[PDB]
């Protein structure tokens, strides 16, 4: 039928898979819903996006988010991107088009990642010296 | 008429002879129309031998990273003892290795 | 302790040996048209409200 549409997630390493289908309520992350966050101080990172908008919208919209890659805080934006990402992949393929413009002017405001993943790279290393722009000791 | 499901496994150092062979491959076999897949294309291994430059401690500490980058490349192909042999004989070449890990 | 809050207008030219000093006009915010030319220490712009309890030393250009 199924009505499913659907996405990925990407911040410095890994992915998620928002299978955003038609069911009754749910938001399964890693085989463990989001009340059950994981590194439980950052916990509020993912909690912004359910409320950044109506916990109203996500009753309809069912996300089994599987989470691989990327130490714990890497993926935190990867699963944030992906609930918004698709927030507009539901609100693009399915829920209209100004519902992607009412949004992205909400979701564009923290004007952050959320939507557009980070750019920055780790710099390659060299010869001689150890994290990156380091040069070995000096002599005389 | 005994059918056999062969699997074709390639490797070289040039992306230009090599790509050449799954164009020739999968169109010297769709001529034959065979039941096959499309040139699967396997993670690029990719060896970096660090070495110093100088012939003698002296002299700054002044190093190299020469390497062979293969493009590993495989295929598929059914067909009896007759029309996998006429195919393995033909692509025939410089740079390249063909195995026929047969599936009788 | 009388504080005279003076607004920077014209950032002028770089100074000091080590470039620790910009020069600086300033427009007195709180007596507009006075337009004295002190110095400061910072990585400045035009509009850095600037803070002086020393009304006034007017300063001269330091190696």
């Amino acid at each position: 039928a199924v009505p499913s549409v659907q996405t990925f997630g990407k911040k410095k390493s890994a992915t998620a898979v928002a299978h955003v289908k038609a069911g009754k309520g749910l938001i399964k992350v890693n085989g463990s819903p989001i009340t059950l966050v994981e590194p439980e101080i950052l916990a509020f990172k993912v909690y912004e996006p359910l409320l950044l908008v109506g916990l109203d919208k996500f009753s309809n919209i069912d996300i089994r988010v599987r989470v691989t890659g990327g130490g714990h805080v890497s993926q935190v934006y990867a699963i944030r991107q992906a609930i918004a990402k698709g927030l507009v992949a539901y609100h693009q393929k399915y829920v209209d088009e100004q519902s992607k413009n009412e949004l992205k002017k909400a979701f564009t405001s923290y004007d952050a990642t959320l939507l557009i993943a980070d750019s920055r790279r780790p710099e390659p290393k060299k010869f001689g010296g150890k994290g990156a722009r380091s040069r070995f000791q000096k002599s005389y | 008429q005994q059918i056999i499901k062969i699997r074709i496994t390639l490797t070289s150092t040039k992306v230009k002879q090599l790509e050449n062979v799954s164009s020739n491959i999968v169109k010297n076999a769709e001529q034959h129309n065979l039941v096959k897949k499309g040139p699967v294309r396997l993670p690029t291994k990719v060896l970096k031998i660090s070495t110093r430059k100088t012939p003698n401690g002296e002299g700054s500490k002044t190093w190299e990273t020469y390497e062979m980058r293969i493009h590993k490349r495989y295929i598929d192909l059914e067909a009896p003892v007759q029309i996998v042999k006429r195919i393995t004989q033909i692509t025939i070449e410089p740079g390249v290795d063909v195995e026929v890990v047969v599936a009788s | 302790t009388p504080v005279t809050l003076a607004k920077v207008i014209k950032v002028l030219g770089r100074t000091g040996s080590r470039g620790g000093v910009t020069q600086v006009r300033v427009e007195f915010l709180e007596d507009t048209s006075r337009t004295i030319v002190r110095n400061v220490k910072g990585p400045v712009r035009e509009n850095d409200i600037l803070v002086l309890m020393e009304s006034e030393r007017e300063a001269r250009r330091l190696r």
């Binding site: 085989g31 463990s32 819903p33 059950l36 | - | -």
Partner: protein, 142 residues
């Protein structure tokens, strides 16, 4: 309707720990108070107790979470690095012994089982005994 997942990672720990403390069946092997688990811990477990009944809900939630594994797997997991001291800090693989024996004691009732390919798979009971006790640890949260 009511999950092992739907519930936290130390209430299920302490509320299967006071289930497998108060079961009696569980057996309790003879180098399981003294002996240092892990050899970089100086300190064995600060419980000396029914870590064995706190390693009996870990192991067990840990299986089911995945397919299969153990003893040279719960060997890379339970330890951490090393205290080498002076020598830049170093991983150390436990002692297959205690959980090579809860894995042959869980084998007993019908909680953990031996996954074909082999080694520890929870049975078919077992799971029955973790979805009964993830819904009795969901109501100390509820």
């Amino acid at each position: 309707g009511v999950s092992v997942r739907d519930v936290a990672a130390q209430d299920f720990i302490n509320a299967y720990a006071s289930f497998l403390q108060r079961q009696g069946k569980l057996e309790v092997p003879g180098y399981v108070d003294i002996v240092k688990t892990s050899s970089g811990n100086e300190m064995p477990p600060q419980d000396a107790e029914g870590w064995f009944y706190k390693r009996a809900a870990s192991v067990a939630r840990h299986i089911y979470m995945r397919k299969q594994v153990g003893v040279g797997k719960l060997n890379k997991l339970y330890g951490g690095a090393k205290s080498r001291g002076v020598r830049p800090y170093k991983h150390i693989d436990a002692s297959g012994s205690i959980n090579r024996k809860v894995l042959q004691a869980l084998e007993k009732i019908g909680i953990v089982e031996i996954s074909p390919k082999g080694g520890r798979r929870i049975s078919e009971n077992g799971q029955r005994d973790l979805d009964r006790i993830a819904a009795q640890t969901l109501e100390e949260d509820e």
